[PDB]
Amino acid sequence: MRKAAGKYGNTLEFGHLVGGEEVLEGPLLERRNPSDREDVVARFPEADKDLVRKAALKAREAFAEWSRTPAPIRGQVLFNLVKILEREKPTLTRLMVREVGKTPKEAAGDVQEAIDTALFFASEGRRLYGQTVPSEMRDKELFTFRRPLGVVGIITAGNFPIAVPSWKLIPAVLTGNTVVWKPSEDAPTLSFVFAKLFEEAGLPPGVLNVVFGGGKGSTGQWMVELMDEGLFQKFAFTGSTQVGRWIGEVAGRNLIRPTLELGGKNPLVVMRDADLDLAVEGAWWSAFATGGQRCTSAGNILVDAPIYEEFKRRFLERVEATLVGNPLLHPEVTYGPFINERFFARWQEHYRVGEAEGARLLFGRGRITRENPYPRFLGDPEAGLYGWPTVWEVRPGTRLFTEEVFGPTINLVKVDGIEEAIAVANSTPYGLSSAIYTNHRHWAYLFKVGIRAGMTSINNATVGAEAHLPFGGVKASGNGGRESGIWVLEEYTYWHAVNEEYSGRLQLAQMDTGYVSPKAPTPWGEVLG
Amino acid sequence: MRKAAGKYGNTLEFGHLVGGEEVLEGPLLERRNPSDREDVVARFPEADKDLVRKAALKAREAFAEWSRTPAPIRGQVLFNLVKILEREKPTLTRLMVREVGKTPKEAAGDVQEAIDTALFFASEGRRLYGQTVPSEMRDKELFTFRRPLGVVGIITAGNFPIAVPSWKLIPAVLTGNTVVWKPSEDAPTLSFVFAKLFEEAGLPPGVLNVVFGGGKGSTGQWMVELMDEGLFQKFAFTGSTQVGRWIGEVAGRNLIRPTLELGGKNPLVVMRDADLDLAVEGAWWSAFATGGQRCTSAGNILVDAPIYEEFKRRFLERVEATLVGNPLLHPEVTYGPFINERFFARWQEHYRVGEAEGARLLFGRGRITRENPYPRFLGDPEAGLYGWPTVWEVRPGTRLFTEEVFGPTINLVKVDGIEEAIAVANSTPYGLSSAIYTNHRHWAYLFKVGIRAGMTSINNATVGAEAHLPFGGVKASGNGGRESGIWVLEEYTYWHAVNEEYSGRLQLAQMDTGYVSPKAPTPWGEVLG
Amino acid sequence: MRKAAGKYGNTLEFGHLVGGEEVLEGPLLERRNPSDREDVVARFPEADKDLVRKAALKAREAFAEWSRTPAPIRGQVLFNLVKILEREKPTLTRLMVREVGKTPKEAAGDVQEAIDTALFFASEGRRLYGQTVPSEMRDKELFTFRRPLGVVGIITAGNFPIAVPSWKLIPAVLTGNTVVWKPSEDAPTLSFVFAKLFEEAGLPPGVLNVVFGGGKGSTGQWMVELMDEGLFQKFAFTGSTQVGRWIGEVAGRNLIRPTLELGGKNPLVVMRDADLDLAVEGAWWSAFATGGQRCTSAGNILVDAPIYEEFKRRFLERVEATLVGNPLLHPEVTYGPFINERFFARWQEHYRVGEAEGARLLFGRGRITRENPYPRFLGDPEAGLYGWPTVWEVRPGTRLFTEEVFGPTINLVKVDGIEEAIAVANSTPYGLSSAIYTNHRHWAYLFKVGIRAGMTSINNATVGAEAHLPFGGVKASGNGGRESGIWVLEEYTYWHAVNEEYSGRLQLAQMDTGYVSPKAPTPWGEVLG
Ligand SMILES: CCCCCCCCO[C@@H]1O[C@H](CO)[C@@H](O)[C@H](O)[C@H]1O
């Protein structure tokens, strides 16, 4: 790599990581600081299909030795990574604030998720339990083993540039797979550095390959297409449902079960008996954490009729207090810029769609500019794409209600009773996260069994999942796979059933099984009388 | 249903089972006894897309009440089925001999697999374990629950008309799902009866719907296409890889992980130190059980060079002793007719492909006729499609070596040493079953870790998997899913992670976590010696 | 603590660790370097019953806050310990060579076991899985949780002064318990330092209390007796079966299940087909690792008749090559001194018992002195208690065959065939470790299912268990408990079953359960053929 002086740090120039070598091949892209476009964070090439193919073949070559490396040793590599991530947490935090516009508080939590993941799977090296199973035949033993799949293709987004990649990278290599990783073009430096920390931790060259570039019409797409050439035995993707469906399609015909985290429209229910201040804080954080650029961000606040006016009043008050700005210059802000222009553009459009379909705009004036200033802004709004906190009143069945919109926007929806709250909460193509604020035992229970969601919070935000629960969605949010904890092992391994015969005879199961039949029954009705 | 007298039993006329009602709608198909075309087993309608859609909506309606039925009660229904299958085993055995041409011995084992499955999952009703998980926050609890998916679409083959459907039907309903089942047109009576046994066991109407018909251009295809209309939350299919890839494709874009069992080309290795008589018997049974119409049937016998001539001699001797015939009239036969004409046709062609590519035909003269008689045939060969036991000598890389061929055919392949045996055993697009005969600890181990297969037998056949191990293949044989035992629960449920807050505060994971930092270290090198 | 200059390092003076405070109360004991009596390693007090009682009450006080500390945070403390043990491994290694007379190679492996344990349970903080279980009633949920027991009393030996204590200390505190630890008077410095490393890692004061002293008539005994006062909710002990039975007795009447590792007489079988050089090396290492002062040390080498003379010849040759000496001055030695005089005394007596009962002494002349020199000795044999490598030929049923003897001694026993090998291998009151050397699949299997032992090695030593398998013995070697891995969690937690009702009615299990009865059966025998 090379470095040059920049505004808020060095501008990094680096290439793809392929077979341990740095490959500077392809038209140069750059990543500008989203808080300040004058600050250039990285310059990096776009990998073409031929280079991704080459990376996949380097991964296949490295897979042989790596899969044969004892899992406890592979786990000790991850343990090295835990120490290295701990050491580098402040540096990675600072780089993440700069590269994707996260607050230092959130950026540290993002790095911490990777540390948590690393520690969890470091120890998993001495687990990866299969089963010993009793044969129905004598002189025979049955076994199950978890085996690695091969080469994993990974495409990740930039909103969680260390945490979410770690959910895939760490289990993948722990279970004995090799990886080709196409990180978001919004967080290439973090991705490059993270790959180098793996190298420092002792991960053999070629086990992790990083190929930079865009998505559609670019490296991301090339990578999906190479599933047709048999170069990936597994695929993982975070992004939109639209793209996920196509990846599911390609994976499906290549007999791959992809890991798909495909976003959501996450209902947060506030029942009449709720702790209003707690529910307001939870709804606020659910909506505006990461500037609403999380898959788990609250989409709709479903508020029970009797507290609707009081909640709206308190919620808008809380929303109005939100600090927005350059988090590098003003750490205390709740959120900073949009991660990229694509998200900003879609978010600008949702104002027009909302007005067109009769949503009531309670708060928000679109992009924050010097001409259109936001009272609690800190820094220069012209330096990047920053969005007004935005609050709507919407009806079910509308586009603002059903469609995911990354960015600082949230809808209030009036409901009456737990039955309607559940029905309305499920009136969305998605089913990722969910939440209900209530002190009512029974309502909490009804919501928990009534919601169709991968994750449910009782008196907690739709965001901030703990790193050691299964993470994933139902309906349009996923395809059944789960990340994190013990539940992700199904994603990166396959079951190998072994039966060992010692009888020296061909014994047929279900046919030669030595089942004992019952004896003649005693007439106990008559004996006991 | 209606019945009329037939040659070897009553001819059954029945319709689709939809919402509890019998629906006799659609152009009539018939199933003739494959051992004797004069014996008509069943007449049944072909369901059009509209009726399958209606069946899927009946399943969705029944799902609400059935998923809310406590799992231990759903398990007690399966326990009722265990008793009913036990009672009906002789009747089902006889019907299976008649309808699909299995031997009574194999037909009983087929019914027994369903009984084993039924008993396993009857008890699973009081298991279905999720987890309690410790929160990193105080006054907070984490939980995981297994939830049913919804409506399961099931398409099954006729080669295992009770066993293999039970692998899907039983776990599906146990886990709280409803089912639309499109059984093979080769085993419609068995399927109808099996569905009625579920009804007798107390399965509520609409939880299992059966729609009869063909595959391509027919009910099977309509059923796959309805995944695009959101009518299936899960899909299971047994059949060819070609069809499986298409089903995987459709499932994939609808964010479904299908259960796909897609056949194999199963290597059986005989090492130089093997028990020859045992390996011969295992190779023979692996090749000719069910007339080689199993997904797990041996495709290639890989024989170690030093025992090659001796094994070939003993194997051909064993093959020559094989009895073939109408298993209804001659129970003692090893195998009877082809299940259908599709399998017979492909099997006839493999002679021409083998000769064309220079395979050496050691034994077999194609279809058994009066003109082309087989010495050990019993009954009338003109009454159905019966195949000569067929043995080839082939080279790796040839079509006979790589391509699956249902029917009584097997290849011998010369290998030298465990390294070559493993490499050649993996030189196939498939990876379902596998086997090695050896007394050498180390060779068994190398094969076990070297093979790419879902299942491996040490000194046992490639066939005859025990019903309580995970069943499934890698590569072209499957997509990662497993059937049977605890491993199939992932197929018919999704994980629901619930976090419950009691702290009355918004606590952020990874950010507010109360991690304890270390104290000042003592310089022990200096303090001690 | 205080330090003074000594021969091979500083002499440490320290007191008991009770509630965070160092308590220098009680008659002073000392630990002399077992390799060199002139080198005084430590001076430390003997805790009386009143101080142990006080330590137990400090543990009870600390238990409240520590058990309420989230398990993931408790795990992060262990993760701190992993880093600290890594840092201190060279220092701990050196101290262990000095204090208990282990070779540097073995001492490092001992420290590494603790690091392995620490890492395993660091990650267990985010596991400790209980279950969610489906109720047979509607509107009801079932849960299981692992809860800590309370205060754990731990008594450990000095032969594995870091490894074996870590097996108890680490899981105990991870699962939320507090500990009173009575370490061996043979390794008080290591124990003091290990406790201080826990303190450095952030373990709250009082969660680990260390009380030094002897066993019988001393601190060890006082500690067992306090189970009668309800001060321990759990107890763990490593030592002799005799003492273990008494501890089991006291624990039993106080409704405690103690963790008891009680030594063994570990059979190593060498079958006629074995790799002789490998079996010789394994038998040699099994016998003389730690100078035969392991619970898992080989007691009897059972050699198959046809290879008996050849094995004896090669084994005695290998034994004769054994280097013995001061491992601080000569790291390359296989073993050094006896850990204590108790073990030396019993080992001296076994010569007299062996001769008395007609055992044939093949090799060994008792204590190594200048008068009685050993050819391959390095250093001064007068400086400590060093034992000749000792090899016997014995018959089954004799005291040398059945009774555990710590120290460098081993018996050869002639057997003929796997049946006799198994019977003779089981002809001992113990059942800890076991091993068989064979290339015969079937013999390995028969031994594996025929042996009565907690642990069995196939073509591996009776020693050197991997730290992530369950460790423990049957018969006189233990009481059912297992240490290490997931299996030790049962030792330090109890199951809490919770049922939550939401139905608003009293529903009786087994009585009000809504079991569905079967429908009227169809006579299928008659309906079909
Ligand atoms: C990693 C995916 C989650 C694993 C689910 C819990 C696994 C627990 O394994 C359990 O073992 C029990 C012991 O008899 C069996 O009875 C249960 O069927 C089985 O679920």
Describe this entry's structure for a reader.
This is part of a larger assembly, with three copies of chain A (529 residues). By secondary structure, chain A is α/β, with parallel strands linked by helices. Chain A has a domain at 2-263 and 483-491: 3-Layer(aba) Sandwich (Aldehyde Dehydrogenase, Chain A, domain 1), CATH 3.40.605. Chain A is built from 15 helices and 23 strands. Chain A has helices at residues 49-67, 71-100, 104-124, 163-174, 188-201, 219-225, 241-253, 276-288, 308-320, 341-356, 399-402, 418-425, 441-450, 489-492, 524-528; strands spanning 2-4, 11-13, 16-18, 21-23, 28-32, 40-45, 132-134, 140-148, 151-155, 178-182, 208-210, 234-238, 259-261, 266-270, 298-304, 324-325, 360-363, 377-378, 390-393, 409-415, 435-437, 455-458, 493-501. A seven-stranded mixed β-sheet of chain A has the order 17-19-20-15-14-21-22, with helices on both faces. The longest helix of chain A has 30 residues, at 71-100. At the A-B interface, α3, β8, α7, α8 and β22 of A face α3, β8, α7, α8 and β22 of B. β7 of chain B pairs antiparallel with β7 (130-134) of chain C, so a sheet runs across the interface. Bound molecules: octyl beta-D-glucopyranoside (BOG). Octyl beta-D-glucopyranoside sits between chains A (486-487, 489) and B (127, 129, 486). It is classed as oxidoreductase.
The global form of chain A is globular
Strand content of chain A: 15-25%
| Largest protein-protein interface | A-B, 87 and 87 residues
Q: What are the distinct ligands in this entry? A: octyl beta-D-glucopyranoside
Counted beta strands of chain A? 23
Query: Do you know the CATH architecture of the domain at 2-263 and 483-491 in chain A?
Result: 3-Layer(aba) Sandwich
Cα Rg of chain A:
26 Å
Q: Strands of the largest sheet of chain A, in order across it?
A: 17-19-20-15-14-21-22
* Helix/sheet category of chain A: alpha/beta
CATH topological fold name of the domain at 2-263 and 483-491 in chain A: Aldehyde Dehydrogenase, Chain A, domain 1
CATH class of the domain at 2-263 and 483-491 in chain A: Alpha Beta
Helix content of chain A: 25-40%
For this structure, the quaternary state is part of a larger assembly
Helix segment tally of chain A: 15
Distance between the termini of chain A: 93 Å
Q: Which sheet architecture does the biggest sheet of chain A show?
A: 7 strands, mixed
In CATH, the homologous superfamily of the domain at 2-263 and 483-491 in chain A goes by the name: Aldehyde Dehydrogenase, Chain A, domain 1
PDB class: oxidoreductase
Keywords: aldehyde dehydrogenase, Thermus thermophilus, oxidoreductase
Entry title: Structure and function of aldehyde dehydrogenase from Thermus thermophilus: An enzyme with an evolutionarily-distinct C-terminal arm (Native protein)
Chains A, B, C: Aldehyde dehydrogenase
